[PDB]
Amino acid sequence: GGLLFHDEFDGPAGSVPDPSKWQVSNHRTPIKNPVGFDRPQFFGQYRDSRQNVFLDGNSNLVLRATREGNRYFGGLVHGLWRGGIGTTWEARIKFNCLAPGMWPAWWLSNDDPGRSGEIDLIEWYGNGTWPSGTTVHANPDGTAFETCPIGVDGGWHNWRVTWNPSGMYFWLDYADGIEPYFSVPATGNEPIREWPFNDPGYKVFPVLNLAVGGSGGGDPATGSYPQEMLVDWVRVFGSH
Ligand SMILES: [Ca+2]
C-alpha cells in the first residue's frame, strides 16, 4: 500500500542489521584542518562490530557508544536503498544517549558527485553548546542550509519528513491533522538559492548514527559508556 522500504529490525540479539538493507560503517572520515574536538584524540571512530551496532532481539536496532582504553567507538548504518521525491520517511527512535560526548542523528543523504545534499531530521549535540534540531543542507559544505531547533527528550518518538515537489515538511510524533513543526519550501532572486532536491532523478538514502566526539559531540573523555540510540523501525512511503 505505498510502502517503498522498511526495516522493522526483527532478529536475534547480537546479530548484524539486515545486510541487504544496511551497510555498517567501519570508518569515520577524519576532519580536514581539525580544531577543538574534531582533533583525532577526541574523534570517536565507527566500527563494524556487534559491540557497537547490533539488533537487541527485541526488534530494535542498537547503536552503542563504547570505550576501550582511550579509544572511543560509536556506530553508523547507511541504507542501501535510495528514494526520490514524493516520499515520506519516518523512524521510531529512543535516545538513551543524551549525554556529553554523544552526537546522535537520523538523516537522509545524497552523495551524487557535484550535487550532494543532506536532510537532517534530528540531531542532538553532546557538546553542551549547540541546540538540538532539524536541518536541510543543499550543499555538502554547510553553507546552504535551513535549520530549526526542536527539543529532544529520552522517550520513544517518531521523526518524519515528507519530501514532495513543493518542499520538505517535518513532524515529531505525526498524527492526522497536526501541522509540521518545520517547513522548507522548494525554490520557486539573485543570488539564486541553492536547491538540488527538485532535480530530475535526485534520490536520498537513510542514515542512523551515534557519533562519539567531534565538534558536535564534545569531549568524549567526559562521556559515559555505554550510551545507546534505539531504533524500533524505519519506514518509507511513496505518494501516488
Ligand atoms: Ca521493531
Numbering used by the authors: 54 to 241, 246 to 297
Copy out sentences from the published article reporting this entry, exactly as the authors wrote them.
The crystal is monoclinic (C121), and its asymmetric unit contains two chains of Rv0315 (designated as chains A and B), and a total of 681 water molecules. Each monomer is composed of 241 amino acids (54–294). The final model of Rv0315 has been refined to Rwork of 18.4% and Rfree of 21.4%. The overall structure comprises 16 β-strands forming two twisted β-sheets, two short a-helices and one calcium ion. The calcium ion binding site is well conserved in GH16 enzymes and has been suggested to be important for protein stability. The β-sheets twist and bend, forming a substrate binding concavity. Two conserved glutamates in the pattern EXDX(X)E are catalytic residues28 in the GH16 family proteins; in Rv0315, Glu-171 is equivalent to the catalytic nucleophile, whereas Glu-176 is the general acid-base catalyst. Rv0315 has a larger cavity than that of the ZgLamAGH16 structure; this large cavity is not present in other known structures of the GH16 family laminarinases. All of these residues related to subsites −2 and −3 were not conserved in Rv0315 and could not form any direct interactions with the substrate. Given all of these differences, polysaccharides may not be able to firmly bind to the cleft of Rv0315 because of its large cavity and the lack of key residues to fix the β-glucans, leading to a lack of detectable catalytic activity for Rv0315.
